[PDB]
Amino acid sequence: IQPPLLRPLAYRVLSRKYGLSIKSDGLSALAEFVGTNIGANWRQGPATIKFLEQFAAVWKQQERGLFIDQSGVKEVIQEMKEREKVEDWRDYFKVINASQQQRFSYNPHKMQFIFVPNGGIAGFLPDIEDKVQMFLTRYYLTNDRVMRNENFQNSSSMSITPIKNLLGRDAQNFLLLGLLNKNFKGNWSLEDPSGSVEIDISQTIPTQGHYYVPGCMVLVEGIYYSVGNKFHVTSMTLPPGERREITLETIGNLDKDLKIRLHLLEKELTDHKFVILGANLFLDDLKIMTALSKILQKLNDDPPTLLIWQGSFTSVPVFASMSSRNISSSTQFKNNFDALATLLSRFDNLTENTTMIFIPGPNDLWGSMVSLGASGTLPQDPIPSAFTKKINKVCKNVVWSSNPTRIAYLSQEIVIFRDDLSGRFKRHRLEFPFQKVQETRKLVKTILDQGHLSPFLDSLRPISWDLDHTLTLCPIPSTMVLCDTTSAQFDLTYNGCKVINPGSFIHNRRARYMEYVPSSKKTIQEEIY
Amino acid sequence: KIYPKLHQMDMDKVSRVYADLRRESISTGSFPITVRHLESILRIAESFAKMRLSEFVSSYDLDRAIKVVVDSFVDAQKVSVRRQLRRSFAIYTLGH
Amino acid sequence: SVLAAANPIYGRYDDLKSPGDNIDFQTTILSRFDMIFIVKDDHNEERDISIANHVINIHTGNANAMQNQQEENGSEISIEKMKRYITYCRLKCAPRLSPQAAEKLSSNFVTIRKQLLINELESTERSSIPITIRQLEAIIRITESLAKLELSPIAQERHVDEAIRLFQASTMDAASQDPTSLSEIRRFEQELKRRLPIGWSTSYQTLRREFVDTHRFSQLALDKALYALEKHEYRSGV
Amino acid sequence: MDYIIDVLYARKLKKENIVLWWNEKAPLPDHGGIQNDFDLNTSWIMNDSEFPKINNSGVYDNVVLDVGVDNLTVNTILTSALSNDALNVLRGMLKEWWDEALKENSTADLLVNSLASWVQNPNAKLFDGLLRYHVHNLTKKALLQLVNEFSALGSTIVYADRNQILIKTNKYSPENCYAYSQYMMKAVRTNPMFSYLDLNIKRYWDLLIWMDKFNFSGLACIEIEEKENQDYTAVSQWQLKKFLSPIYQPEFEDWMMIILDSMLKTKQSYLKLNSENSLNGFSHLFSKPLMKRVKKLFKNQQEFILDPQYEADYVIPVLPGSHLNVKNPLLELVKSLCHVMLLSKSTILEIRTLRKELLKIFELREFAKVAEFKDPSLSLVVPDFLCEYCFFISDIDFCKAAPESIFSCVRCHKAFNQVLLQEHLIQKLRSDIESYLIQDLRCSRCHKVKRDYMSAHCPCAGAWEGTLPRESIVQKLNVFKQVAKYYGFDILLSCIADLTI
Amino acid sequence: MYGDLGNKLVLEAKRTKQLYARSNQDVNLPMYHEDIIRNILKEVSNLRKNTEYLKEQQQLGMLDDKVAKCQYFVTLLCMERNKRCLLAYQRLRTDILDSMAWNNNGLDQQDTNNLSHQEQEYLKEYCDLITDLKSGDLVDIDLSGSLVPPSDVFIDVRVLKDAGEIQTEYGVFNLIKDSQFFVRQSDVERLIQQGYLQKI
Ligand SMILES: [Zn+2]
Ligand SMILES: [Zn+2]
């Protein structure tokens, strides 16, 4: 509507203000916008000015007179205006899979260079650079946290000595930081990007506060004996950890006022229940089915703000059967998943304003095909979407996530993972020639201080190379959920961060799920049957 | 006045030729085959085309150049391998 | 900066022959000239095909022109003014050539020294005269070669000098593996494998058995064994 | 009845000092306490459990498909008797069952047949991955020894399937050789200390044009052996001929019958002369009809192309095997003809002559990569697939085999259920995925293996090259998707959907 | 020696300013040399640590201010030198920032990687301030107006790149590739700012 009259007006508004180019077509766009203005175009001047400011703020592009992209600019402008006339808890607490968390890589120039994970069929497969960089990233995070902690100890305490610089002198003592592994010679080798040194396990005292298994970093002191070529370490100490707040303040602000506002809101929040059923829930057993039904009846009284479903949903491993018994094991696994969806939906207060989070297990398929009884790769594969059907429609709150599940909490951070890491530690605890509560405390100190969720050799347990950032304890969550069936159930707080161990679903003969209030910072466990 | 030009050429024919050239120098009666040998074949093609007197190289004249060079190579071999090599190159010889 | 031109012996490099036979030049001359380099038989019939394509392309004027312009616009960038830039940037060499080096070089220099010690470890029996002075020419080589690399066009000295020293190390190893060179270790791995399938059990169990878990054999003899075995014995192909 | 195999093996072990490893809770073998330790060897034993196949594509004067030995696993484990303790216990049990397998109840025979399945069945307990891998390796050495034994005879093994073994005889001898062939293979089987391999040599081919399992022209199968007197019609699946355009397929098939007839006639001519030179004469015999019909067809295609009715038929059907360019499907026809002809080594020169003639017929360089065939097979195979009713062990190739061939096995009429097919296909696919996740790098110059976890380039000058990356695994995933369109495969569809995420 | 690190930093800064100054045209801002910056940061922290040791030094036995206090004052000299070097470098950086803002955001190193965060929002807010100067009063003149005296309002210009029609104040103008166009000076200037025109 009347372009030429608007022509000098629009010229004044845009070109004189910003030196911006407008085509005849975008000017015609403004003409029909003026037509949409039933009133005469007098205050469109200020309206066009706000239009220009929004365009400069968002698009930052020349050639505004598009009427195509400019039409979208008009739409954004009218959305903003509608927001002008009209002038949270659910947004946070989001459930993210293993691959959802943004990748992060260490860089000497920028303490944590930003990286990107991978949902692409081509993207999800790791690379050669991913192979080298998962190891290198574990080492670099260990090195940076160690140097910060050594600065804390003394401007800094004793400094590590490059493996290569070691052998240059025989009888001299040195500080080391490297990854422990079995040397193909047969000795225990400490390996870093500079190299690797076989370590004399004799005359070596472990730090009693930490576990020690092959495939872990360590800070050690001793003589090397270049003639003997094996580092005669005297004292062996796991690399000290760093508090999440301390790590954040060392790395600076990244994504204070927002955090404190969320903390105040969470303290205002009350009775938020974080319920974890316990390791190895079995859908096959009828007695366990009745116990879980009673548990759901109990949860119906107060719908928990968090519900965790643990690995090994099926009793016995499900896998391919060439000797089929007229019905595939995968079909029973699917039917077990389909079952209890009605039970969840039967209880009205249950599955309303709720969330159910499911963790894969070794007995679960895609984790049993890889290894029937054992678990496969360290980031466990979630169940197929086909096995998720009708339970997602009967129950809207069921969430299917991989084993390294994280929750982006508004005032805290929660990491969910299920594995029998305690058994792995016990079968890999080292003997040095040189109680359950204490051993769990040692395990917690080990996990936190080492800075990795499962500091194990990739050969022992496959680790997703492009997903190694999650497996490293880069965030150091204030609360971390680790469900170990083998380990004794407990909840512990270390280095300003709380570690919760749900344990088995049934300890000996009775059903038992935890309940946790994030504001109260306390975990309570109930008993059924 | 005559300056034949390789405007048209058979890239992959020469490629398979040099491929066969390979794994033959392994023979005790076989001398090594190198890049300068290939350049030799190219200049033999140029000489043939000049001999044809056309200002443009002919593909089949270049083929006869290939034939002459490969026959010279075969003659250079030990007679024991020479027969096996001539059978192998027979896939090239008929095209001349 | 002298660039040599010697086809070592019998024309070919003869990497599978004793370096003394291979290198007619005295090894003292090699050390004093501080550089070593090898041209070997590429084979790679597919790569030979590709080389033939390239050579004909540069040989046929119609194709020659397109490679010429392709190189010129992006890479060949007026070779004359490359020489001009080289003069200007060797004027830019002289100001400083190890600001970024110091910290990383403090480790990597002694590192490469240690790999030279490793090399004499694989070259027990001294592997004759030619291999002994190579460590000294190499330690001088690092010092001269960091400056040679200038810090690259700018400030990239050590990170690439490491790769270059690796390249030179394996360059000499192709001639310093033995005093027949690779042929002797090939014979060693053959006289090894003459028992591996028929006897010598299998699957590292025999290595855990003989010589009391091969410990005496492991440090030197088994390392020499595997260095010979490795050449004959999910990232690139599929 | 593999659970009965479990209970009997448990009873047998209980007799000895060693005690059973049976565990109902976990069908995986329960050795020691871990039962769940994972390493490179753990995946090594379960994976790559496929029977290697030896194929020599050619055309030969006298070919025999031979006995076609079945149930080679139990035969091999019995012949091995001619860890070690468990191996000895299983060998004693197998010899006991073999004694029961002869002149006794059919239940003993069924148990013997199903023992091989139990040795490989993960669902059946007392199943050891080491046991399955070692039985596979034993079958490998058995095939190697069979090859060596055939090597002594004046005959060449042109194909090896470990289910049917294919050998041609070098001599041009007539009918009497077939009886002599029976006598010699009796002498061959008598020599070694085995008795469990299939006898009754069968399906001899007086002429065979061997390309693969599904492309061949065998003639005059097992009979009174009169050398083509009672000529059985040439059995020819032609998984590539099916690939062809449905209109060009009859032409290609008709010309391969013409070719077969011509080589046969030259074969009697050569035999009368004696009283592959016959193929050499065959080449010159059919050269003129071949070249004349080629251009004729090319000339027709000149106007045949650009016709909406014709192009609907001319389009090459989309099949999982091939991904080659269209390249004038008639040209594809002659390229396929060249490939099937290229088998005869002697006629390869005459084949080159025919190719020169054809490139004169349609303009193209005398030697050309575009002229080269490079036929894609894209064979998706599950290693050592088994039919529970038939108990036969054989690799099943989903893309190459006919749609009912995957469904129903050759031995028994029983048809494979789709669910286990998808389960096994996804098993191989992902198992390769984790293999990709657990590989070991290999250097560029020295070519050592990555013994170092902290490598960051080799201690050698070369970098770590690698062996088998993601990209062709992704194209294999695309082939899986194509099969999923071809065959419903809901489990496969779910697996594909997961892998995309 | 402590300022020597700062000496290298200021030599680098002088190299950068020479590089920019010798070219009248805009020089993309070089990478922020935060390596040296952080090195000086640790040095000053440890310098502060040594100053604290001087205070505790005295509290214990270094009570000879003539000596101890002299040492502390010297430290002060070193730290002040380092601080002034850093101030000079940062001021030079900010001068470059203002130059680039006027030449690009005001007349119309686009990437911020060469630039640290703090100074990133510094330059953004500086551009906002420039707009504010343009805003309200003095809107009549271009705050970043051309500093060359105006020669002739009407000049013919050939279109450097074809970009279709662009609306002027009153006359339609299509940017057809390489088309002469003889019109007033405002439009041609502003299109030169985008560079779509050429040859004057
Ligand atoms: Zn069957
Ligand atoms: Zn290497």
PDB file of N, CA and C in Angstrom, chain D residues 130-186:
ATOM      1  N   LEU D 130      34.842 -70.011  23.997  1.00  0.00           N
ATOM      2  CA  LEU D 130      36.077 -70.685  23.614  1.00  0.00           C
ATOM      3  C   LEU D 130      35.782 -72.004  22.918  1.00  0.00           C
ATOM      4  N   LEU D 131      34.798 -72.755  23.416  1.00  0.00           N
ATOM      5  CA  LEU D 131      34.439 -74.018  22.779  1.00  0.00           C
ATOM      6  C   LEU D 131      33.936 -73.795  21.359  1.00  0.00           C
ATOM      7  N   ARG D 132      33.051 -72.813  21.173  1.00  0.00           N
ATOM      8  CA  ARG D 132      32.532 -72.534  19.839  1.00  0.00           C
ATOM      9  C   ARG D 132      33.645 -72.093  18.898  1.00  0.00           C
ATOM     10  N   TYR D 133      34.514 -71.194  19.364  1.00  0.00           N
ATOM     11  CA  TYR D 133      35.605 -70.718  18.522  1.00  0.00           C
ATOM     12  C   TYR D 133      36.568 -71.843  18.175  1.00  0.00           C
ATOM     13  N   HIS D 134      36.861 -72.722  19.133  1.00  0.00           N
ATOM     14  CA  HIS D 134      37.797 -73.803  18.866  1.00  0.00           C
ATOM     15  C   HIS D 134      37.195 -74.849  17.939  1.00  0.00           C
ATOM     16  N   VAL D 135      35.890 -75.106  18.044  1.00  0.00           N
ATOM     17  CA  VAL D 135      35.235 -75.991  17.083  1.00  0.00           C
ATOM     18  C   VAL D 135      35.269 -75.374  15.691  1.00  0.00           C
ATOM     19  N   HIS D 136      35.047 -74.061  15.605  1.00  0.00           N
ATOM     20  CA  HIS D 136      35.159 -73.374  14.323  1.00  0.00           C
ATOM     21  C   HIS D 136      36.563 -73.508  13.746  1.00  0.00           C
ATOM     22  N   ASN D 137      37.584 -73.307  14.580  1.00  0.00           N
ATOM     23  CA  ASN D 137      38.963 -73.433  14.119  1.00  0.00           C
ATOM     24  C   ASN D 137      39.278 -74.865  13.700  1.00  0.00           C
ATOM     25  N   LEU D 138      38.760 -75.844  14.442  1.00  0.00           N
ATOM     26  CA  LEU D 138      38.950 -77.239  14.069  1.00  0.00           C
ATOM     27  C   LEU D 138      38.326 -77.528  12.713  1.00  0.00           C
ATOM     28  N   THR D 139      37.132 -76.989  12.463  1.00  0.00           N
ATOM     29  CA  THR D 139      36.524 -77.141  11.145  1.00  0.00           C
ATOM     30  C   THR D 139      37.369 -76.459  10.075  1.00  0.00           C
ATOM     31  N   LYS D 140      38.015 -75.345  10.426  1.00  0.00           N
ATOM     32  CA  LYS D 140      38.922 -74.694   9.482  1.00  0.00           C
ATOM     33  C   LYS D 140      40.085 -75.609   9.113  1.00  0.00           C
ATOM     34  N   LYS D 141      40.739 -76.204  10.116  1.00  0.00           N
ATOM     35  CA  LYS D 141      41.818 -77.144   9.811  1.00  0.00           C
ATOM     36  C   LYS D 141      41.303 -78.368   9.063  1.00  0.00           C
ATOM     37  N   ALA D 142      40.068 -78.788   9.338  1.00  0.00           N
ATOM     38  CA  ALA D 142      39.496 -79.911   8.602  1.00  0.00           C
ATOM     39  C   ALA D 142      39.339 -79.572   7.127  1.00  0.00           C
ATOM     40  N   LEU D 143      38.838 -78.373   6.831  1.00  0.00           N
ATOM     41  CA  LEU D 143      38.736 -77.938   5.443  1.00  0.00           C
ATOM     42  C   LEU D 143      40.115 -77.826   4.805  1.00  0.00           C
ATOM     43  N   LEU D 144      41.100 -77.336   5.561  1.00  0.00           N
ATOM     44  CA  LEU D 144      42.458 -77.239   5.034  1.00  0.00           C
ATOM     45  C   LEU D 144      43.021 -78.613   4.694  1.00  0.00           C
ATOM     46  N   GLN D 145      42.811 -79.594   5.572  1.00  0.00           N
ATOM     47  CA  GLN D 145      43.292 -80.946   5.309  1.00  0.00           C
ATOM     48  C   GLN D 145      42.568 -81.569   4.125  1.00  0.00           C
ATOM     49  N   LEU D 146      41.264 -81.310   3.997  1.00  0.00           N
ATOM     50  CA  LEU D 146      40.530 -81.789   2.830  1.00  0.00           C
ATOM     51  C   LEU D 146      41.086 -81.178   1.550  1.00  0.00           C
ATOM     52  N   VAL D 147      41.423 -79.888   1.593  1.00  0.00           N
ATOM     53  CA  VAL D 147      42.013 -79.226   0.435  1.00  0.00           C
ATOM     54  C   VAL D 147      43.360 -79.849   0.092  1.00  0.00           C
ATOM     55  N   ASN D 148      44.192 -80.089   1.107  1.00  0.00           N
ATOM     56  CA  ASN D 148      45.493 -80.711   0.871  1.00  0.00           C
ATOM     57  C   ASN D 148      45.333 -82.098   0.266  1.00  0.00           C
ATOM     58  N   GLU D 149      44.362 -82.868   0.759  1.00  0.00           N
ATOM     59  CA  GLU D 149      44.121 -84.199   0.218  1.00  0.00           C
ATOM     60  C   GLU D 149      43.657 -84.129  -1.231  1.00  0.00           C
ATOM     61  N   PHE D 150      42.774 -83.178  -1.549  1.00  0.00           N
ATOM     62  CA  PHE D 150      42.370 -82.987  -2.938  1.00  0.00           C
ATOM     63  C   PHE D 150      43.521 -82.473  -3.791  1.00  0.00           C
ATOM     64  N   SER D 151      44.479 -81.776  -3.178  1.00  0.00           N
ATOM     65  CA  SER D 151      45.599 -81.226  -3.933  1.00  0.00           C
ATOM     66  C   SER D 151      46.459 -82.331  -4.531  1.00  0.00           C
ATOM     67  N   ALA D 152      46.622 -83.440  -3.806  1.00  0.00           N
ATOM     68  CA  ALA D 152      47.420 -84.550  -4.317  1.00  0.00           C
ATOM     69  C   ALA D 152      46.819 -85.117  -5.597  1.00  0.00           C
ATOM     70  N   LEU D 153      45.497 -85.246  -5.644  1.00  0.00           N
ATOM     71  CA  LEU D 153      44.829 -85.705  -6.852  1.00  0.00           C
ATOM     72  C   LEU D 153      45.008 -84.691  -7.976  1.00  0.00           C
ATOM     73  N   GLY D 154      45.064 -85.195  -9.207  1.00  0.00           N
ATOM     74  CA  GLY D 154      45.209 -84.337 -10.368  1.00  0.00           C
ATOM     75  C   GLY D 154      43.950 -83.551 -10.664  1.00  0.00           C
ATOM     76  N   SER D 155      43.509 -82.761  -9.689  1.00  0.00           N
ATOM     77  CA  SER D 155      42.270 -82.007  -9.784  1.00  0.00           C
ATOM     78  C   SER D 155      42.399 -80.741  -8.950  1.00  0.00           C
ATOM     79  N   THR D 156      41.611 -79.729  -9.301  1.00  0.00           N
ATOM     80  CA  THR D 156      41.688 -78.418  -8.668  1.00  0.00           C
ATOM     81  C   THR D 156      40.361 -78.084  -8.001  1.00  0.00           C
ATOM     82  N   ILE D 157      40.432 -77.576  -6.772  1.00  0.00           N
ATOM     83  CA  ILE D 157      39.247 -77.165  -6.023  1.00  0.00           C
ATOM     84  C   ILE D 157      38.887 -75.755  -6.483  1.00  0.00           C
ATOM     85  N   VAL D 158      37.915 -75.652  -7.387  1.00  0.00           N
ATOM     86  CA  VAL D 158      37.554 -74.346  -7.923  1.00  0.00           C
ATOM     87  C   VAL D 158      36.619 -73.609  -6.971  1.00  0.00           C
ATOM     88  N   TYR D 159      35.936 -74.336  -6.092  1.00  0.00           N
ATOM     89  CA  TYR D 159      35.090 -73.709  -5.088  1.00  0.00           C
ATOM     90  C   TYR D 159      35.096 -74.525  -3.804  1.00  0.00           C
ATOM     91  N   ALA D 160      34.907 -73.827  -2.685  1.00  0.00           N
ATOM     92  CA  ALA D 160      34.876 -74.448  -1.364  1.00  0.00           C
ATOM     93  C   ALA D 160      33.822 -73.737  -0.528  1.00  0.00           C
ATOM     94  N   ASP D 161      32.802 -74.479  -0.095  1.00  0.00           N
ATOM     95  CA  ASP D 161      31.737 -73.922   0.728  1.00  0.00           C
ATOM     96  C   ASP D 161      31.661 -74.542   2.117  1.00  0.00           C
ATOM     97  N   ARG D 162      32.324 -75.683   2.331  1.00  0.00           N
ATOM     98  CA  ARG D 162      32.328 -76.422   3.593  1.00  0.00           C
ATOM     99  C   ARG D 162      30.973 -77.080   3.829  1.00  0.00           C
ATOM    100  N   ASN D 163      30.011 -76.792   2.958  1.00  0.00           N
ATOM    101  CA  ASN D 163      28.749 -77.514   2.869  1.00  0.00           C
ATOM    102  C   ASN D 163      28.664 -78.361   1.614  1.00  0.00           C
ATOM    103  N   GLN D 164      29.089 -77.807   0.481  1.00  0.00           N
ATOM    104  CA  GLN D 164      29.354 -78.564  -0.732  1.00  0.00           C
ATOM    105  C   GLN D 164      30.721 -78.141  -1.245  1.00  0.00           C
ATOM    106  N   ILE D 165      31.538 -79.113  -1.638  1.00  0.00           N
ATOM    107  CA  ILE D 165      32.913 -78.865  -2.050  1.00  0.00           C
ATOM    108  C   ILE D 165      33.008 -79.134  -3.547  1.00  0.00           C
ATOM    109  N   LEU D 166      33.542 -78.169  -4.290  1.00  0.00           N
ATOM    110  CA  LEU D 166      33.522 -78.199  -5.746  1.00  0.00           C
ATOM    111  C   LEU D 166      34.936 -78.352  -6.289  1.00  0.00           C
ATOM    112  N   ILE D 167      35.158 -79.415  -7.059  1.00  0.00           N
ATOM    113  CA  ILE D 167      36.448 -79.702  -7.672  1.00  0.00           C
ATOM    114  C   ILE D 167      36.226 -80.098  -9.124  1.00  0.00           C
ATOM    115  N   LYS D 168      37.100 -79.608  -9.999  1.00  0.00           N
ATOM    116  CA  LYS D 168      37.128 -80.010 -11.398  1.00  0.00           C
ATOM    117  C   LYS D 168      38.346 -80.892 -11.629  1.00  0.00           C
ATOM    118  N   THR D 169      38.234 -81.825 -12.571  1.00  0.00           N
ATOM    119  CA  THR D 169      39.358 -82.685 -12.915  1.00  0.00           C
ATOM    120  C   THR D 169      40.107 -82.106 -14.110  1.00  0.00           C
ATOM    121  N   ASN D 170      41.439 -82.105 -14.024  1.00  0.00           N
ATOM    122  CA  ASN D 170      42.255 -81.498 -15.072  1.00  0.00           C
ATOM    123  C   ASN D 170      42.101 -82.232 -16.400  1.00  0.00           C
ATOM    124  N   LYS D 171      42.051 -83.560 -16.360  1.00  0.00           N
ATOM    125  CA  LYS D 171      42.028 -84.350 -17.583  1.00  0.00           C
ATOM    126  C   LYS D 171      40.707 -84.184 -18.327  1.00  0.00           C
ATOM    127  N   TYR D 172      40.772 -84.355 -19.649  1.00  0.00           N
ATOM    128  CA  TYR D 172      39.612 -84.292 -20.527  1.00  0.00           C
ATOM    129  C   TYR D 172      38.971 -85.660 -20.736  1.00  0.00           C
ATOM    130  N   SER D 173      39.105 -86.559 -19.765  1.00  0.00           N
ATOM    131  CA  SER D 173      38.728 -87.950 -19.953  1.00  0.00           C
ATOM    132  C   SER D 173      37.210 -88.118 -20.044  1.00  0.00           C
ATOM    133  N   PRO D 174      36.743 -89.130 -20.797  1.00  0.00           N
ATOM    134  CA  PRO D 174      35.300 -89.317 -21.013  1.00  0.00           C
ATOM    135  C   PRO D 174      34.593 -90.071 -19.894  1.00  0.00           C
ATOM    136  N   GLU D 175      33.344 -90.469 -20.161  1.00  0.00           N
ATOM    137  CA  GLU D 175      32.436 -91.130 -19.223  1.00  0.00           C
ATOM    138  C   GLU D 175      33.121 -92.106 -18.273  1.00  0.00           C
ATOM    139  N   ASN D 176      34.016 -92.944 -18.803  1.00  0.00           N
ATOM    140  CA  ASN D 176      34.689 -93.938 -17.971  1.00  0.00           C
ATOM    141  C   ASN D 176      35.444 -93.294 -16.817  1.00  0.00           C
ATOM    142  N   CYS D 177      35.840 -92.029 -16.970  1.00  0.00           N
ATOM    143  CA  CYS D 177      36.490 -91.321 -15.875  1.00  0.00           C
ATOM    144  C   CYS D 177      35.537 -91.116 -14.706  1.00  0.00           C
ATOM    145  N   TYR D 178      34.242 -90.954 -14.986  1.00  0.00           N
ATOM    146  CA  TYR D 178      33.279 -90.727 -13.913  1.00  0.00           C
ATOM    147  C   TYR D 178      33.207 -91.925 -12.975  1.00  0.00           C
ATOM    148  N   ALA D 179      33.166 -93.136 -13.534  1.00  0.00           N
ATOM    149  CA  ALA D 179      33.355 -94.320 -12.705  1.00  0.00           C
ATOM    150  C   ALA D 179      34.748 -94.324 -12.088  1.00  0.00           C
ATOM    151  N   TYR D 180      35.759 -93.952 -12.876  1.00  0.00           N
ATOM    152  CA  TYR D 180      37.102 -93.800 -12.333  1.00  0.00           C
ATOM    153  C   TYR D 180      37.159 -92.677 -11.307  1.00  0.00           C
ATOM    154  N   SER D 181      36.349 -91.629 -11.485  1.00  0.00           N
ATOM    155  CA  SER D 181      36.262 -90.582 -10.470  1.00  0.00           C
ATOM    156  C   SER D 181      35.705 -91.133  -9.165  1.00  0.00           C
ATOM    157  N   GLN D 182      34.675 -91.977  -9.249  1.00  0.00           N
ATOM    158  CA  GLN D 182      34.148 -92.607  -8.044  1.00  0.00           C
ATOM    159  C   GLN D 182      35.206 -93.479  -7.381  1.00  0.00           C
ATOM    160  N   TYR D 183      35.936 -94.264  -8.176  1.00  0.00           N
ATOM    161  CA  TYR D 183      36.981 -95.107  -7.600  1.00  0.00           C
ATOM    162  C   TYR D 183      38.057 -94.265  -6.925  1.00  0.00           C
ATOM    163  N   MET D 184      38.470 -93.169  -7.567  1.00  0.00           N
ATOM    164  CA  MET D 184      39.541 -92.366  -6.993  1.00  0.00           C
ATOM    165  C   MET D 184      39.075 -91.645  -5.737  1.00  0.00           C
ATOM    166  N   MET D 185      37.804 -91.225  -5.673  1.00  0.00           N
ATOM    167  CA  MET D 185      37.380 -90.523  -4.464  1.00  0.00           C
ATOM    168  C   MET D 185      37.125 -91.505  -3.323  1.00  0.00           C
ATOM    169  N   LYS D 186      36.747 -92.751  -3.642  1.00  0.00           N
ATOM    170  CA  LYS D 186      36.833 -93.816  -2.643  1.00  0.00           C
ATOM    171  C   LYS D 186      38.252 -93.951  -2.103  1.00  0.00           C
TER     172      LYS D 186
END
